[PDB]
Design a protein around this ligand. Structure first.
Ligand code: BCL
Ligand code: BCL
Ligand code: BCL
Ligand code: BCL
Ligand SMILES: CC[C@H]1c2cc3[nH]c4c(c3C)C(=O)[C@H](C(=O)OC)c4c3nc(cc4[nH]c(cc(n2)[C@@H]1C)c(C(C)=O)c4C)[C@@H](C)[C@@H]3CCC(=O)OC/C=C(\C)CCC[C@H](C)CCC[C@H](C)CCCC(C)C
Ligand SMILES: CC[C@H]1c2cc3[nH]c4c(c3C)C(=O)[C@H](C(=O)OC)c4c3nc(cc4[nH]c(cc(n2)[C@@H]1C)c(C(C)=O)c4C)[C@@H](C)[C@@H]3CCC(=O)OC/C=C(\C)CCC[C@H](C)CCC[C@H](C)CCCC(C)C
Ligand SMILES: COC1=C(OC)C(=O)C(C/C=C(\C)CC/C=C(\C)CC/C=C(\C)CC/C=C(\C)CC/C=C(\C)CC/C=C(\C)CC/C=C(\C)CC/C=C(\C)CC/C=C(\C)CCC=C(C)C)=C(C)C1=O
Ligand SMILES: COC(C)(C)C/C=C/C(C)=C/C=C/C(C)=C/C=C/C(C)=C/C=C\C=C(C)\C=C\C=C(/C)CC/C=C(\C)CCC=C(C)C
Ligand SMILES: COC1=C(OC)C(=O)C(C/C=C(/C)CCC=C(C)C)=C(C)C1=O
Ligand SMILES: CCCCCCCCCCCC[N+](C)(C)[O-]
Ligand SMILES: CCCCCCCCCCCC[N+](C)(C)[O-]
Ligand SMILES: CCCCCCCCCCCC[N+](C)(C)[O-]
Ligand SMILES: CCCCCCCCCCCC[N+](C)(C)[O-]
Ligand SMILES: CCCCCCCCCCCC[N+](C)(C)[O-]
Ligand SMILES: CCCCCCCCCCCC[N+](C)(C)[O-]
Ligand SMILES: CCCCCCCCCCCC[N+](C)(C)[O-]
Ligand SMILES: [Fe+3]
Lengths: 302, 281, 240
């Protein structure tokens, strides 16, 4: 076959793109990192710059703290033995306090308190990273769409680790920090709630997850198919529709009898994605708080 | 019937079969040979489902279910009412999906664009064919395929999954799930990114691609670029479906015990298999 | 109960959202038209949305959508049948007339600008200091058409400065002038660049640009359309 636009045939390079200034405090920006010829076959070669800042630093530090609290506990569970550490890596787990401690912070270090400390570092890493998605857009005079979408993911997270436990009346309802154990939690959660397949919000969540693969497949493929007409320059096609945008739209119109625009597709996208965690969070939040058994709920239709 | 820019594109040519016989539209819809084939397969398939519903004795869409032949039939033909209808409907569905894709190719040819869309759709078809054709053939029976019913198809997912314990431990399923989750993440971000530029703070000028790169580099120290993100979403979602097919083509064939036990090979490696302490000692 | 209230509310929200999403996607190409240019009788159940206004940067004005929709160009096609829904035959040479897969849109006859108001795409020989950094360097290679004949030689790469990416090869013809070929329509091999879309004798036909060191949205559309259109219209002379 002829050229397909999955990998570039020819890379070009020029001076390091330090970026748009706008209201960004450039004091807080790194300089570039190295150029990856490897990455540049597919996307951009340039690494950096990144933007530091106080929140940046706080989030990053708190994030590591979280990772290290879980890690210390892992080592300790390995009895400090490096070869046991690697062996049982996916089997280690930092668990929340037992039910009897309810929502109190009393729980002893080895018996729930360490989970809480890690949860604290996580709570501040994430929310401060969110402030970051907002402020970085602000500094550049852009819309707040990223911070808005991030909030959907945050919602499910919040519901799993924080809102549901509080509503359920105990931290023991929350998710353990571990590879295999978080899966076991996932499977038990469903079992204990009458099988999540009867939770209408689990169903919708699945529709949007599958929907996102369908849509990004469709959009990704469409843009590459019209990249020979400059299709990937999406903003200039928004401001000044070209033959790329027209052939794009007409492909879908001829196929399935309707179509999008160069801006509107990105609205289908954002909403397909955020709806995953949006409905998902609601599905989980209602579980155990309002519905004990989804199968039972589904028999009364509600 | 036409978009304000459509007419210039509605020229003759690009068909794969039948020259200009079916080279025409119906409202917005292109037809072509494969438009016609699609209608035939889809209509047959729907009629056969309706018949199946009459034999099953219900018109409720929550109830209608079309099951494959029981395992005793192996790979033979079952009597119509005991799985044969499932078999003909499955031929029809494949007929319709493949026809749909080939129609998409005809459209691509008319429009002078790349073939990426039908090629991407081909992965979805392959996943379908994995569940209903490849895996059953490999396992010796049509009965391993999923039934065609809104709820019953979900029974099959559950029963199949739990047949191997907690399906979470299928390693190929873990990779698949990761591509799905990463895709949804990237879709959210690509969408948000483009819209945040096209729709800046009140009264400001539209931002540029430079601002998009800047925003992301600022946030995480990298930006894949605009060609890259569209390559990325394509890759992520196609990979999700590839590893979905893989994770099932291997279940009940090369591996058929509890998936959790597959992980034992790591733990039982000579050099640490016996060291005490940790979880497994 | 609350779960029922929640699911029922969500379905209402979702209908509204699909409505919002469908209307948002009608800001171009609408209202629908008959094959002759006039508003169609049947417009569908979704209305057009209230217009929105994009402030363009670099003083280039605004875009308001939806708004009056016009091709702003002649369209050399004619009906081939007495009823709705059939193909329209080109009345001239569809490559030259810019119809079918050779179509172009009449976009602004200015260049895309970067975030700083400089030209987004420049020839590399005028981009300080861009260079080929990986892969076979096409500059200097003979250019082969799908008739397997040489049509010229690559004399430069046109690059997207802010995205540091190759967009066109500038190709010199037997007569000393050049043409841009879209990067996505050439195959860079080791001893040649191959162009499947065009036979060699169609290269003089590529729409020329008006200033030799920049390119406009309008000219880009004309170049890409012409070259793509070759896949259908050059096929009698191919041989792939
Ligand atoms: C949704 C319902 C369940 C659950 C269901 C499942 C199922 C089922 C699976 C996962 C899987 C994943 N889950 Mg989980 N998952 C839960 C929510 C979480 C949360 C959280 C709430 O913050 C996190 C961080 C994780 C992250 C993990 C990853 C280990 C893995 C890949 C996810 C991914 O591609 O992300 C997006 C990709 C990114 C770009 C970022 C993530 C990269 C990874 C490496 C970071 C996550 C943790 C990290 C510290 C791993 C350390 C590795 C070693 C210990 C050193 N899960 C909830 C409780 N999850 C899959 C897996 O393979 O597990 C083994 C899998 O099959
Ligand atoms: C993919 C892996 C599993 C799978 C496991 C799950 C699980 C788990 C769930 C579903 C659910 C869905 N599955 Mg399933 N199911 C699979 C097989 C498929 C196949 C197929 C291969 O042909 C089809 C058509 C469906 C479609 C269905 C939908 C009824 C529902 C929403 C899906 C969705 O938004 O997709 C994303 C794509 C879009 C957003 C595009 C929309 C296309 C949909 C609406 C087409 C529906 C067709 C359906 C009514 C069949 C009628 C055909 C007519 C006779 C023409 N499944 C296999 C067996 N499926 C969810 C549900 O709630 O079911 C009750 C759910 O929780
Ligand atoms: C046996 C298992 C049960 C069931 C258990 C449950 C449970 C429990 C849950 C799901 C959930 C979901 N299920 Mg289920 N699931 C079932 C079977 C299925 C099947 C199938 C059978 O084919 C499918 C396709 C799905 C898939 C789905 C998803 C649509 C959904 C998760 C959305 C998501 O994006 O989370 C992934 C995204 C997140 C978790 C958000 C991430 C949050 C951010 C803030 C975390 C950042 C981490 C960061 C700090 C880490 C840093 C590392 C970096 C590298 C730097 N389920 C069966 C019946 N499922 C979730 C749901 O919403 O249910 C309603 C959920 O809680
Ligand atoms: C209790 C159940 C088990 C389990 C059961 C298994 C089983 C069994 C399967 C999966 C498979 C899936 N599981 Mg699992 N898995 C579980 C829970 C999880 C969890 C979770 C968070 O808990 C998640 C995220 C997932 C995720 C995954 C995905 C990797 C995969 C489904 C996507 C897919 O195959 O698409 C592929 C795409 C398709 C099949 C759709 C193609 C349809 C196209 C070709 C045509 C349809 C068009 C037509 C009908 C439309 C109508 C026309 C209208 C006009 C629209 N599983 C639990 C542990 N899982 C499935 C898989 O990998 O299959 C390959 C699978 O069979
Ligand atoms: C439907 C919505 C989907 C979604 C949305 C979403 N997620 C997002 C965003 C949005 C739009 C945000 O803008 C935000 C983001 O900035 O992304 C780039 C984010 C994000 N989602 C992320 C993860 C994530 N999202 C997921 C879920 C989803 N995200 C959904 C699928 C998942 C899953 C599926 O479990 C994961 C795990 C991050 C990439 C980012 C949030 C970043 C964050 O909150 O960080 C806080 C903690 C730290 C800053 C440090 C963590 C500790 C690390 C171990 C340190 C790494 C740094 C180190 C110095 C490097 C050293 C390297 C070595 C490890 C080799
Ligand atoms: C490869 C990544 C993802 C992907 C890609 C993808 N899907 C695509 C496309 C691509 C690029 C197409 O271009 C095509 C499209 O035109 O999109 C609008 C399509 C498409 N994906 C669709 C659905 C779909 N895709 C799926 C998902 C995926 N598709 C993957 C996640 C799923 C999931 C996740 O379950 C579904 C439900 C359709 C909207 C469309 C194909 C439409 C089509 O082929 O129509 C022709 C045939 C008919 C109109 C009906 C035929 C009826 C049959 C004869 C009888 C029905 C039998 C059936 C087996 C019953 C099933 C019962 C269920 C309850 C289980
Ligand atoms: C920038 O570019 C882009 C655009 O363009 C500017 C686009 O629009 C699109 C297209 C994407 C959208 C419009 C977004 C919305 C799409 C989704 C949410 C994905 C889900 C799709 C559906 C739910 C629609 C399903 C409908 C189908 C498949 C057809 C149904 C029609 C029939 C009745 C079929 C019957 C048989 C036919 C029509 C064959 C024809 C023959 C005869 C009639 C005879 C993308 C991807 C894009 O990236
Ligand atoms: C090599 O070794 C070293 C030590 C150097 C480093 C290695 C460390 C390792 C191996 C770390 C590995 C970590 C792993 C495996 C982590 C896995 C994480 C997973 C899978 C978690 C998934 C679920 C997480 C959820 C749902 C978390 C939700 C958290 C919240 C919502 C926070 C709630 C806040 C609480 C309870 C604190 C309350 C305080 C306030 C604000 C009042
Ligand atoms: C809005 O679009 C997005 C980009 O921004 C322009 C990205 O770039 C990425 C990140 C992609 C990759 C390949 C990171 C790999 C980099 C290193 C350091 C190895 C994602 C997901 C994305 O959604
Ligand atoms: C997902 C990012 C990583 C992608 C790296 C893949 C490297 C592939 C290199 C292929 C080079 C193609 N070629 C020969 C034309 O140069
Ligand atoms: C998620 C992608 C993470 C990208 C990491 C950020 C790169 C910053 C590099 C600056 C340091 C320069 N260096 C490596 C040459 O020393
Ligand atoms: C951006 C919106 C895309 C629309 C997709 C909507 C599909 C509906 C899927 C049915 C889910 C059924 N149920 C019972 C589990 O709720
Ligand atoms: C959830 C899937 C339901 C199928 C309906 C999908 C909408 C496509 C309708 C196209 C419009 C037909 N038209 C233009 C002739 O009116
Ligand atoms: C969940 C996706 C729903 C897709 C259906 C929404 C639009 C279907 C057809 C829109 C109308 C097309 N039309 C007649 C305006 O050209
Ligand atoms: C074989 C699967 C069962 C056939 C489903 C019947 C087709 C009607 C359309 C399905 C959507 C369900 N709905 C909206 C009527 O409730
Ligand atoms: C964020 C872009 C990079 C892709 C990361 C996707 C997570 C799953 C990684 C598993 C990779 C397995 N693989 C393809 C190398 O075999
Ligand atoms: Fe896009």
């Amino acid at each position: 076959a002829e050229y397909q636009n999955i990998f570039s045939q020819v890379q070009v390079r020029g001076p390091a793109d330090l970026g748009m200034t706008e209201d960004v405090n450039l004091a807080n920006r790194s300089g570039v990192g190295p150029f990856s010829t490897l990455l540049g076959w597919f996307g951009n070669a340039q690494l950096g710059p990144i933007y530091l800042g106080s929140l940046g630093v706080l989030s990053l530090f708190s994030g590591l703290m979280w990772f290290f609290t879980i890690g210390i506990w892992f080592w300790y569970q390995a009895g400090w033995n490096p070869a046991v550490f690697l062996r049982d890596l996916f089997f280690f787990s930092l668990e929340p306090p037992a039910p009897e401690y309810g929502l109190s912070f009393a729980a002893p270090l080895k018996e729930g308190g360490l989970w809480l400390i890690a949860s604290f570092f996580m709570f501040v890493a994430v929310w401060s990273w969110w402030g970051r998605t907002y402020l970085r857009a602000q500094a550049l005079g852009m819309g707040k769409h990223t911070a808005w979408a991030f909030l959907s993911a945050i919602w499910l997270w919040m519901v799993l680790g924080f809102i549901r436990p509080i509503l359920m009346g105990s931290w023991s309802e929350a998710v353990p920090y571990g590879i295999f154990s978080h899966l076991d939690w996932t499977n038990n959660f469903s079992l204990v709630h009458g099988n999540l397949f009867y939770n209408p919000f689990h169903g919708l969540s699945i529709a949007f997850l599958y929907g996102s693969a369908l849509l990004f497949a469709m959009h990704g493929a469409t843009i590459l198919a019209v990249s020979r007409f400059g299709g990937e320059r999406e903003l200039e096609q928004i401001a000044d529709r070209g033959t790329a945008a027209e052939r794009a739209a007409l492909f879908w119109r001829w196929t399935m009898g309707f179509n999008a625009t160069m801006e509107g597709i990105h609205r289908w996208a954002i909403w397909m994605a955020v709806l995953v965690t949006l409905t998902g969070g609601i599905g989980i939040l209602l579980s155990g708080t309002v519905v004990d058994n989804w199968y039972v709920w589904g028999q009364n239709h509600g | 019937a036409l978009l304000s820019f459509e007419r210039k594109y509605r020229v003759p040519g690009g068909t794969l079969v039948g020259g200009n016989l079916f080279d025409f539209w119906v409202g917005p819809f292109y037809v072509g040979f494969f438009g016609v084939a699609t209608f035939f397969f889809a209509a047959l398939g729907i009629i056969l489902i309706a018949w199946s519903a009459v034999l099953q004795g219900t018109w409720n869409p929550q109830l209608i279910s079309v099951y494959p032949p029981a395992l005793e039939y192996g790979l033979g033909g079952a009597p119509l009412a005991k799985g044969g209808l499932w078999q003909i409907i499955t031929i029809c569905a494949t007929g319709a999906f493949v026809s749909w894709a080939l129609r998409e190719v005809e459209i691509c040819r008319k429009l002078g664009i790349g073939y990426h869309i039908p090629f991407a759709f081909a992965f979805a078809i392959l996943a379908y064919l994995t569940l209903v054709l490849f895996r059953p053939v490999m396992m010796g029976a049509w009965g391993y395929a999923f039934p065609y019913g809104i709820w019953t198809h979900l029974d099959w997912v559950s029963n199949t999954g739990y047949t191997y314990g907690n399906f979470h431990y299928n390693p190929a399923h873990m990779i698949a799930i990761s591509f799905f989750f990463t895709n949804a993440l990237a879709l959210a971000l690509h969408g948000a990114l483009v819209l945040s530029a096209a729709n800046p703070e009140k009264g400001k000028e539209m931002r540029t691609p430079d601002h998009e790169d800047t925003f992301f580099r600022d946030l995480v120290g990298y930006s894949i670029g605009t060609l890259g993100i569209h390559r990325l979403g394509l890759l992520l979602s196609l990979s999700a479906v590839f590893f979905s097919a893989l994770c099932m083509i291997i279940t009940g064939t090369i591996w058929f015990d509890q998936w959790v036990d597959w992980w034992q090979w790591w733990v039982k490696l000579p050099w640490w298999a016996n060291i005490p302490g940790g979880i497994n000692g | 109960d609350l779960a029922s209230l929640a699911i029922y509310s969500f379905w209402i929200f979702l209908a509204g959202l699909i409505y919002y999403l469908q209307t948002e996607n009608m800001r171009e190409g609408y209202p629908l038209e008959n094959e002759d240019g006039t508003p169609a009788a049947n417009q569908g159940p979704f209305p057009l949305p209230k217009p929105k206004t994009f402030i363009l940067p670099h003083g280039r004005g605004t875009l308001t959508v939806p708004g009056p929709e016009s091709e702003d160009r002649p369209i050399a096609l004619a009906r081939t049948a007495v009823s709705e829904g059939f193909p329209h035959a080109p009345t001239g040479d569809p490559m030259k007339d810019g119809v079918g897969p050779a179509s172009w849109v009449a976009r602004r006859d200015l260049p895309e600008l970067d975030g700083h108001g400089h030209n987004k795409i420049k020839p590399m020989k005028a981009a300080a200091g861009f260079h080929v950094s990986a892969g076979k360097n096409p500059i200097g290679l003979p250019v082969r058409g799908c008739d397997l004949e040489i049509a010229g030689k690559v004399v430069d790469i046109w690059v997207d400065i802010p995205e540091q990416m190759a967009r066109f090869l500038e190709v010199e013809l037997k007569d000393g002038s050049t043409r841009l070929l879209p990067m996505q329509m050439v195959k860079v091999q080791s001893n040649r660049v191959h162009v499947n879309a065009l036979s060699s004798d169609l290269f003089a036909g590529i729409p020329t640009i008006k200033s030799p060191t920049e390119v406009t949205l309008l000219e880009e559309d004309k170049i890409c359309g012409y070259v793509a259109g070759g896949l259908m219209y050059a096929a009698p002379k191919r041989k792939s």
